[PDB]
Point group: C3
Chain length 152, copies 3
């Protein structure tokens, strides 16, 4: 369970919780300023216990091996743009099952879209999630084309 | 006990030592290039054993919950400006009792005053001191207005 | 065994392996994207088992206490310039016996040559290799004069 940081952003990647992890998974989150968690992998637990905790749970699962939607990209970006400004020094926990694939991509995106070449972003994430990213994923980031409409 | 880094600065936040910690607390420090330690919380031990070690101990304690002086700010800034230039790659250990409040503020300051929006600085510190900073503290950083007279 | 990161670069400093470490030292490397390892300290093991692993082993040992060649500097720079572009998000493991001396210098170089004042680079490395660098080494970095021909 590692967290990154760029500019005013602070993402936390996580180990997909069980259904018995929760109460302590939320205690953990609760103490990371994580006011939002974007599920990317298939949901494997309630979100009521979470929601009833103040943590907003947005889940947009997608085929592990399939480039992360086209739409999702925009909700992420649109979400990211805001929050970090809405609540300064907060945090977005993005988690997938393994958290070395889709979870990083998402994060690796905001880090691009918000400046930083993709290489600088892959190195940056691997710096804190050794092994993260695979041939496909990489290929896809390389091919990603940012709008770069992010001003800080 | 975590250390940060920005530009040519390298701050180390610490767990307020006991009076039995010292000898090993200084061994630890001694091996961080820390040639100075600014006490922010109430002093709870001698400084002779420290001073007699080459580590300069400046202590400017202040009410935990009270914005860190107005003067202190300038001694910090004035101190920080220098040292990191005086002895390159050295270090300033700032410590308070908890080290999640005043200690960070001080540090979080130099990181502002030396560039970097405050959000970028809160995220940066929390990246390495999860939970650090509270409603008040934050509010105060937000309201801090830098001179920005720091050239690197 | 720590790794750093600047721009598109990702260096990993390592504990000089034994001759019984290998198989697991390569398993470790293998999982850091390290496709190259520049030996700076005297070689104390084969490189066949390594080479036969896809990891390119360049070794340019030099007197521990003697500024790192004059030529070596250029092979490093010339090597560094490339690879990180050749294979994005890869890694170069530089290792010496202690890995708090020559190994850092090498790394501390690319970080200079690729921008960043030397102070910013010493602090940056010590941030992740506390104690790294000595009076001499430092003196030498300070006196290093970059070409700064690195564009990212």
């Amino acid at each position: 369970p590692v967290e990154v940081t760029y500019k005013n952003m602070r993402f936390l990647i996580t180990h997909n919780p069980t259904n018995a992890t929760l109460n302590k998974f939320i205690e953990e989150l609760k103490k990371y300023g994580v006011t939002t968690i974007v599920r990317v992998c298939e949901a494997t637990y309630d979100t009521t216990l979470v929601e009833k905790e103040g943590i907003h749970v947005l889940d947009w699962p997608f085929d592990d091996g399939a480039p992360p939607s086209n739409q999702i990209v925009d909700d992420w970006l649109s979400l990211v743009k805001i929050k970090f400004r809405e609540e300064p020094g907060c945090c977005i926990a993005v988690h997938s099952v393994a958290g070395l694939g889709r979870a990083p991509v998402l994060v690796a995106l905001a880090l691009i879209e918000g400046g930083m070449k993709y290489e600088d972003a892959v190195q940056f994430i691997r710096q804190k999630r050794r092994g993260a990213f695979n041939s496909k994923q990489l290929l896809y980031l390389e091919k990603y084309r940012p709008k770069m409409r992010l001003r800080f």
